[PDB]
Design a binder for this molecule. Sequence first.
Ligand SMILES: *SCCNC(=O)CCNC(=O)[C@H](O)C(C)(C)CO
Length: 246
Amino acid sequence: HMFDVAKYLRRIGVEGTPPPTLDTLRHLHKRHLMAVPYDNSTAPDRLPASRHLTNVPLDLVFGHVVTEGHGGVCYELNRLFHTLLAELGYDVRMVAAAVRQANGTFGPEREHTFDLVHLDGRTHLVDVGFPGPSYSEPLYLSEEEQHQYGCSYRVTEHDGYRVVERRPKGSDWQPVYRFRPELADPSGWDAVRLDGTTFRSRATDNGKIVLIGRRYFTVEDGVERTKVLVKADEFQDVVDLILAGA
Ligand SMILES: *SCCNC(=O)CCNC(=O)[C@H](O)C(C)(C)CO
């Protein structure tokens, strides 16, 4: 189907057309993460031969995620959300980032794609398309510590980058990803180049649930628990729980 704001809001459980304020942005962001799961299971099926994101019609993505109710990956979910926010009146700018790996280092510079919103003189980070543990409500572009559902966040400056860092209960600060704010671009999605483990996740009311391969992670009010799933029926119950949304 063709991109439609009203249909999208209905998909994520938002009623009416709330006004273009910070309180609305916080609600949209959290509802989107609860309703629309991250899922890379069929991402390669939507890759274009040319590696230019522009050759992937926005309507194809909209059909898969909003009309048919499936999940997607960062350059699908945040691409759609950018378009929704722009239609709702926000000043949204696209930015790319390098992700802190499982080995502790940062990956390629443009692996991850998300957005910034400038509103009433402050800049907020917007990301509804990151598979791992991260923020469910927008962050201020500030090194000042910020708290959401028992987790702490901050956006520090290191070596020409801004670094999103997260600190759950009983753990030290850990980078999530890093980006260059000066490379943000209102039209950045039109320039994105797309040059075996399954990753699925979604937010809950008070945290997030994440399944990478057999590794099942939950955070609830900042309290983390992990379990390497063995049984086939428990594994499928966890997949269904994530993909059904909330
Ligand atoms: S389209 C966005 C691509 N980025 C991406 O898949 C990040 C995956 N990596 C992580 O999420 C992180 O490095 C782990 C493995 C530590 C899990 O959060």
